[PDB]
Amino acid sequence: MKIAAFDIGGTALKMGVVLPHGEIILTKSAEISGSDGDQILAEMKVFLAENTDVTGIAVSAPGYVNPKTGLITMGGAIRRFDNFNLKEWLEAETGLPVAIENDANCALLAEKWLGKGQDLDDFLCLTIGTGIGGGIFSNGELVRGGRFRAGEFGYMFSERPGAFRPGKYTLNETTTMLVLRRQYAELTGRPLEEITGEEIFANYDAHDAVSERLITEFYTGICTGLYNLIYLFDPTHIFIGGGITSRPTFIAELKHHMESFGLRDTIIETATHKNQAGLLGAVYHFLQEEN
Amino acid sequence: MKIAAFDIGGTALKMGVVLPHGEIILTKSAEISGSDGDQILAEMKVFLAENTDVTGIAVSAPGYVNPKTGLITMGGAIRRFDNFNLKEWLEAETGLPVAIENDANCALLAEKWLGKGQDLDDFLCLTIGTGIGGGIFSNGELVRGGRFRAGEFGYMFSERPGAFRPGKYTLNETTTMLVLRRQYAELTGRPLEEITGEEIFANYDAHDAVSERLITEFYTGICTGLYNLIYLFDPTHIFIGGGITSRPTFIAELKHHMESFGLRDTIIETATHKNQAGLLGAVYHFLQEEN
């Protein structure tokens, strides 16, 4: 058994041939322009023709996916995949068994299978980069929700909502690495495209007041979301991943900030398998489905 | 089989003899002073001696309860029940099988057993009165959490947390029937003890500006919590109960307010069995445990 795995990202499509124990024996990546579903389907077709010994296909996809039927009801950034049965498409194209699961869920499944969540029944995964991702593991099972939408952690309010559209008051729009860069551009007058997260943190470490405020507010927003999650789900562990891991000391920094809030026994630590989690979790889902 | 059921409330202890199909053939209630655990234990002993044909005991208790062992790790308002195994106490006192579950969880279980959640795998219960309660049903199972703490909906932030203790910025302290009365007392200068929720709503319906603001802010806080819950859990239904049901049109009023937020397919409606939900859910848990 050799499984063709696909992980549909924000800017790249990752692909691999994976053995049932998580050994990835071949990889391929492609930059994808403007999250164009047709380009993604084309890259898939090309990878499959190149790898004729695969016996199964496993997909990690953005948006909302019925994991049994393969119907993507909302394709995340990929409008082409709205109301698209990608499982049935791939089955028709190849004659191979296919499984599909949401991207955040797949990364959580990687954590459960091969990472730090192997023996945990109640943990969350929180991903912080350009946006916010979430996955929920409760009672030893993924929580997908009634319409496969669960885990939208970025939609939590970080402040009392005002009169602009509600999204503006949510973590997705207040508390991300992108928002930090946007704010720094506004405060300094410099072009966004020339600002890095690394420089903001470097300025922070050099006690720059503007940077201090930006980072302080960022951590407060993260703490707001963590407090909500802790009280709602009562996980034992929250694994934090994404672009934020570009800050080496971020877990220690969050714990410090959390002294004003209270972790309340919850363990916070980094997620594992940053590079391959989507592929590996897609495989885990596929392996569960084959049984 | 006749089950002695106990539901430990904020100001009353409800008691009943319940048949396995939810017919409650006898009831008794006692006002409890200052949530005194010893008084509760005394009332239990008296009810049991009065009802010698009971064959089992089912408890709905505040705080955090290990439902298999019966250990109450934190007794809610009842300090006497902190780190107290109420299951083992009752077993030793009576020789009868005993089950125990948290109060919010029991009320949700009543909804699942006999109410509006019978055929639902993903729903929440939100209780709004003097404080806020929560119960979570995901993947066809109660979510209790890693330490039996899950469902603390009142700890969600309704605004960006400030520098006072975090609780002050949570639904428990910003968005309750008690907070409404407190605010009305502050705004009018009248004593809290002389203010009713009913008068605030009556003044609201008569277009009193002060009342309008209080009610508007209350509904915004509820909408903040509902939006968070909807995105996190993706329930099909959220059942809302508690003191707030003293407002006959509150569901219609919340739906109206939610037009600025978006229910996103979620059905909101009132919880059922307001009077007996704790008793009935305690029984359901007991019946599950006996198998």
Side-chain angles (χ1 to χ4, degrees):
Chain A
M1 233 83 101
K2 286 176 174 185
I3 300 155
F6 299 97
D7 178 26
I8 301 165
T11 62
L13 173 65
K14 295 173 174 160
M15 318 173 231
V17 173
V18 191
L19 302 181
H21 76 118
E23 181 181 355
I24 296 176
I25 67 169
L26 185 135
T27 61
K28 191 185 180 185
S29 172
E31 289 290 302
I32 298 290
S33 200
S35 295
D36 172 348
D38 294 309
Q39 191 60 33
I40 292 160
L41 295 170
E43 299 283 349
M44 288 173 166
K45 271 185 86 67
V46 167
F47 188 77
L48 291 165
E50 293 174 336
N51 290 286
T52 60
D53 49 356
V54 307
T55 58
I57 303 169
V59 180
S60 157
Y64 307 145
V65 174
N66 179 328
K68 288 192 179 158
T69 70
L71 178 64
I72 301 174
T73 61
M74 194 276 307
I78 312 169
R79 294 282 64 76
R80 170 70 182 87
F81 291 174
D82 292 336
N83 189 34
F84 178 49
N85 198 312
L86 177 57
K87 180 178 164 179
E88 287 176 356
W89 187 85
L90 284 166
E91 287 170 335
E93 290 291 317
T94 66
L96 293 174
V98 180
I100 184 160
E101 177 56 271
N102 159 271
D103 61 343
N105 293 347
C106 285
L108 183 148
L109 291 173
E111 209 65 63
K112 173 63 173 176
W113 185 17
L114 299 173
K116 296 176 169 182
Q118 292 169 313
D119 299 298
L120 302 184
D121 286 344
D122 292 279
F123 71 98
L124 312 174
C125 293
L126 169 63
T127 304
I128 306 168
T130 63
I132 304 285
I136 303 156
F137 206 73
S138 298
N139 291 318
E141 273 190 80
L142 185 63
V143 173
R144 300 183 189 78
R147 297 175 169 81
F148 313 108
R149 308 186 293 196
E152 283 283 22
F153 294 176
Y155 282 77
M156 292 186 279
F157 285 120
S158 60
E159 61 187 276
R160 180 214 171 246
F164 288 95
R165 66 186 172 70
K168 285 186 164 183
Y169 308 97
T170 72
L171 292 168
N172 276 325
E173 307 189 38
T174 65
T175 314
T176 71
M177 299 294 282
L178 179 54
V179 165
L180 278 173
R181 295 171 54 243
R182 287 186 46 234
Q183 292 167 342
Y184 199 69
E186 289 189 357
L187 272 289
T188 62
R190 294 174 52 194
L192 178 62
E193 58 268 31
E194 288 169 20
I195 296 161
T196 66
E198 181 181 313
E199 84 183 280
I200 301 165
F201 277 106
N203 294 336
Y204 174 73
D205 288 338
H207 315 294
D208 177 61
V210 156
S211 301
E212 288 172 341
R213 182 174 178 76
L214 298 192
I215 297 305
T216 303
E217 297 285 303
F218 176 70
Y219 285 150
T220 294
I222 297 168
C223 287
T224 302
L226 285 175
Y227 187 95
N228 285 341
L229 292 170
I230 286 164
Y231 282 95
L232 294 178
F233 289 94
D234 181 36
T236 62
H237 294 67
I238 303 176
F239 301 114
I240 310 176
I244 196 173
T245 76
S246 65
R247 175 68 172 179
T249 57
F250 92 90
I251 292 289
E253 290 184 279
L254 280 179
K255 285 177 180 175
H256 182 80
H257 216 81
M258 282 297 291
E259 293 188 2
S260 298
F261 295 91
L263 283 162
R264 200 210 55 183
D265 310 298
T266 314
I267 291 164
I268 65 170
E269 60 185 307
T270 56
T272 62
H273 304 88
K274 164 185 271 286
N275 300 303
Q276 299 187 321
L279 297 170
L280 293 164
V283 171
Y284 186 89
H285 174 62
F286 175 96
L287 290 171
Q288 281 197 314
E289 285 293 286
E290 287 298 296
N291 299 309
Chain B
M1 233 83 101
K2 286 176 174 185
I3 300 155
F6 299 97
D7 178 26
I8 301 165
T11 62
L13 173 65
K14 295 173 174 160
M15 318 173 231
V17 173
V18 191
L19 302 181
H21 76 118
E23 181 181 355
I24 296 176
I25 67 169
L26 185 135
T27 61
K28 191 185 180 185
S29 172
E31 289 290 302
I32 298 290
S33 200
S35 295
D36 172 348
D38 294 309
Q39 191 60 33
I40 292 160
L41 295 170
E43 299 283 349
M44 288 173 166
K45 271 185 86 67
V46 167
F47 188 77
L48 291 165
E50 293 174 336
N51 290 286
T52 60
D53 49 356
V54 307
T55 58
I57 303 169
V59 180
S60 157
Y64 307 145
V65 174
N66 179 328
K68 288 192 179 158
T69 70
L71 178 64
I72 301 174
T73 61
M74 194 276 307
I78 312 169
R79 294 282 64 76
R80 170 70 182 87
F81 291 174
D82 292 336
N83 189 34
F84 178 49
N85 198 312
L86 177 57
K87 180 178 164 179
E88 287 176 356
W89 187 85
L90 284 166
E91 287 170 335
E93 290 291 317
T94 66
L96 293 174
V98 180
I100 184 160
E101 177 56 271
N102 159 271
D103 61 343
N105 293 347
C106 285
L108 183 148
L109 291 173
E111 209 65 63
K112 173 63 173 176
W113 185 17
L114 299 173
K116 296 176 169 182
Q118 292 169 313
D119 299 298
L120 302 184
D121 286 344
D122 292 279
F123 71 98
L124 312 174
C125 293
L126 169 63
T127 304
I128 306 168
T130 63
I132 304 285
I136 303 156
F137 206 73
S138 298
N139 291 318
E141 273 190 80
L142 185 63
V143 173
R144 300 183 189 78
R147 297 175 169 81
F148 313 108
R149 308 186 293 196
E152 283 283 22
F153 294 176
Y155 282 77
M156 292 186 279
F157 285 120
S158 60
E159 61 187 276
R160 180 214 171 246
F164 288 95
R165 66 186 172 70
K168 285 186 164 183
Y169 308 97
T170 72
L171 292 168
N172 276 325
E173 307 189 38
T174 65
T175 314
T176 71
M177 299 294 282
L178 179 54
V179 165
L180 278 173
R181 295 171 54 243
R182 287 186 46 234
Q183 292 167 342
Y184 199 69
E186 289 189 357
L187 272 289
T188 62
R190 294 174 52 194
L192 178 62
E193 58 268 31
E194 288 169 20
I195 296 161
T196 66
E198 181 181 313
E199 84 183 280
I200 301 165
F201 277 106
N203 294 336
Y204 174 73
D205 288 338
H207 315 294
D208 177 61
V210 156
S211 301
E212 288 172 341
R213 182 174 178 76
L214 298 192
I215 297 305
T216 303
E217 297 285 303
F218 176 70
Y219 285 150
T220 294
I222 297 168
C223 287
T224 302
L226 285 175
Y227 187 95
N228 285 341
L229 292 170
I230 286 164
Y231 282 95
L232 294 178
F233 289 94
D234 181 36
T236 62
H237 294 67
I238 303 176
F239 301 114
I240 310 176
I244 196 173
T245 76
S246 65
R247 175 68 172 179
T249 57
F250 92 90
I251 292 289
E253 290 184 279
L254 280 179
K255 285 177 180 175
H256 182 80
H257 216 81
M258 282 297 291
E259 293 188 2
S260 298
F261 295 91
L263 283 162
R264 200 210 55 183
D265 310 298
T266 314
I267 291 164
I268 65 170
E269 60 185 307
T270 56
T272 62
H273 304 88
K274 164 185 271 286
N275 300 303
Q276 299 187 321
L279 297 170
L280 293 164
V283 171
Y284 186 89
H285 174 62
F286 175 96
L287 290 171
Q288 281 197 314
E289 285 293 286
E290 287 298 296
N291 299 309

